[PDB]
Design a protein around this nucleic acid. Structure first.
Length: 128
DNA sequence: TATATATATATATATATATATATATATATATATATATATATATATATATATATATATATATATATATATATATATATATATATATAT
């Protein structure tokens, strides 16, 4: 276990280390092509979500930051999908997620279902 | 010891020719400048008057696009760390 004093102390030491020209460049240049792979591998998956969800939002007349609300929701759905996969667990996730957005951010349930209807292909609850 | 010839100089006497300068007298031509008088042309600037075009900036008014940051609101992805929980 670690107290704040300890949390910070070590954080500082590592931050300092990293800031060193040679340390930063050593690490970053070594993980360059690796990171590139990872970025390329997963990012396109979410871009397509942003696109399709955007299309939906335009059909629903959603503008400004309100689009951003639903986009965040959609992205979250996709995230869970990637880290969990479709089926039961995803259903459990989406149900809670909807509750989160509906009541915490006053997102419109109906539109939220429209978002799910794209990413998953249908509203949740039932697997299909 | 003298004389002669051939070259390298210096002088005594004047003259001539050829080059390198300086002056006395004016004029002419050709170049390198400076001025007196105006005008013209061509370039290098500065100003008086406005306008136009092209570039280098600053602002007044809003909007748009492209990059460099900071924040407001959440979410996502990718990397750099710290922790909460176990493996």
């Amino acid at each position: 276990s670690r107290s704040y004093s300890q949390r910070y102390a070590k954080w500082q030491a590592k931050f300092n280390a990293f800031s060193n020209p040679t340390v930063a460049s050593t690490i970053l240049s070594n993980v360059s092509p690796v990171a590139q792979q990872n970025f390329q591998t997963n990012v396109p998956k979410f871009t397509s979500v942003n696109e399709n969800v955007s299309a939906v939002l335009t059909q629903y007349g959603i503008t400004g930051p309100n689009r951003a609300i639903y986009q965040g929701f959609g992205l979250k759905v996709a995230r869970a999908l990637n880290r969990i996969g479709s089926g039961p667990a995803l259903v459990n996730m989406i149900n809670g997620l909807k509750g989160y957005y509906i009541s915490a951010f006053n997102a419109n349930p109906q539109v939220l279902d429209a978002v799910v209807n794209i990413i998953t292909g249908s509203p949740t609850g039932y697997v299909s």
